[PDB]
Structure 1
Amino acid sequence: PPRKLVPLAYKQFSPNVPEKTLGASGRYEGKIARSSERFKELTPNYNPDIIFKDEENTGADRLMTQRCKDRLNSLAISVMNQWPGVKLRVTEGWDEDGHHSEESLHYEGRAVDITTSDRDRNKYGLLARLAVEAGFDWVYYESKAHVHCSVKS
């Protein structure tokens, strides 16, 4: 049974502090490449009820941290329960393509860009609220095209 929520406004973030603060996701610890020793800290997410964009054909999006994975996995349930017939969609997980601002938590597989499988942007406000309640250490309506989520280290 879907729940009544308070949507996040565009460009809003929760908690109401910068992402790299202790009350949010914490500081940037370094860029993880495939060769990086910490790369092995990234597990692929193979949830059947999460749609991964994977336009790279490398499955990089599925790569994330155990924490990002837990928060994400329970958001997938939150989304189907909110809009039966609609699934959680990931457009960006861990990244090695490099279009993200240096010190991006995407390079550490600690962040995800998410949307709704139907791309109904009217759902994005709520989607953001859900991510917050899913345990995501930082949620940020970063764009009209996606919501930004991240976790501590």
Structure 2
Amino acid sequence: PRKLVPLAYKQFSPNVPEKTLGASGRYEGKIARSSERFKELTPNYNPDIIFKDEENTGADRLMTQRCKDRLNSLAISVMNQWPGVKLRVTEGWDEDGHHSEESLHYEGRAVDITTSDRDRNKYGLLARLAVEAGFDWVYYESKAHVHCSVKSEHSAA
């Protein structure tokens, strides 16, 4: 086994920019409910994940299949890491323009996460678990959350 080293505040892994092919790849444009690409999004109702849903719209649950798969893997690892604690999503798909101009939040490929107990001291390790869970980019963006994203299925050729 390898020793698990938490990410430090503002560290990102892999250590390259988010929207490079070695990480989560390109911005593909905003997804709105009326978009054809809204069909890229699937609602995550994993009982072992808490969703903040501050907008009261269920947007936080709507994400791409790859995002869902990586998040679901991480959910198991979080419960393993801290028995009694669960993975929590505080911001998923954003319909409201609350990020920078070309955010993967706008297309359901990024989630901001915490632990269910909101113990900020756990977040560096949470970030390392997100890397181990296979998220394509993980960024300890604020003391209050870890930003995790995935690539799209649209660079296969």
Between the aligned partners of 2:143 and 2:86, the Cα distance in structure 1 is 18
Between the aligned partners of 2:89 and 2:2, the Cα distance in structure 1 is 22
TM-score, length of structure 2 as denominator length: 0.94
Between the aligned partners of 2:4 and 2:58, the Cα distance in structure 1 is 33
Between the aligned partners of 1:115 and 1:68, the Cα distance in structure 2 is 16
Between the aligned partners of 2:97 and 2:52, the Cα distance in structure 1 is 17
Residue 126 of structure 1: CA displacement? 0.3
Q: For 1:90, what is the secondary structure of its paired residue?
A: strand
Residues 3 and 89 of structure 1, relative CA distance in 2, 3 Å threshold? farther
What's the Cα RMSD here? 1.6
Q: For 1:141, what is the secondary structure of its paired residue?
A: strand
Per the alignment, residue 40 of structure 1 pairs with 39
Aligned sequence identity (%): 99
Between the aligned partners of 1:5 and 1:57, the Cα distance in structure 2 is 36
Residue 5 of structure 1: CA displacement? 1.3
Residue 135 of structure 1: CA displacement? 0.4
Task: Find out whether 1:63 has 2:62 as its counterpart.
Answer: yes
Gaps of 5+ in 2: 152-156
Residue 40 of structure 1: CA displacement? 1.0
Between the aligned partners of 2:76 and 2:2, the Cα distance in structure 1 is 13
Matched pairs, number: 152
Between the aligned partners of 1:7 and 1:63, the Cα distance in structure 2 is 28
Between the aligned partners of 1:72 and 1:143, the Cα distance in structure 2 is 19
Residues 70 and 6 of structure 1, relative CA distance in 2, 3 Å threshold? same
Residue 102 of structure 1: CA displacement? 1.0
Residues 3 and 116 of structure 1, relative CA distance in 2, 3 Å threshold? farther
Residues 56 and 13 of structure 1, relative CA distance in 2, 3 Å threshold? same
Residue 4 of structure 1: CA displacement? 4.7
Between the aligned partners of 1:125 and 1:57, the Cα distance in structure 2 is 28
Per the alignment, residue 20 of structure 2 pairs with 21
Is contact 1:3-1:82 (8 Å) kept? no
Residue 98 of structure 1: CA displacement? 1.2
Between the aligned partners of 2:2 and 2:105, the Cα distance in structure 1 is 30
Between the aligned partners of 1:15 and 1:149, the Cα distance in structure 2 is 11
Residue 97 of structure 1: CA displacement? 1.5
Is contact 1:17-1:23 (8 Å) kept? yes
Any idea what the Cα deviations from partners look like across 1:88-129, whole Å, max 9, x if unmatched? Answer: 000011110211111100001000000010111110000000
Q: For 2:16, what is the secondary structure of its paired residue?
A: coil
Between the aligned partners of 1:54 and 1:7, the Cα distance in structure 2 is 27
Between the aligned partners of 1:122 and 1:110, the Cα distance in structure 2 is 25
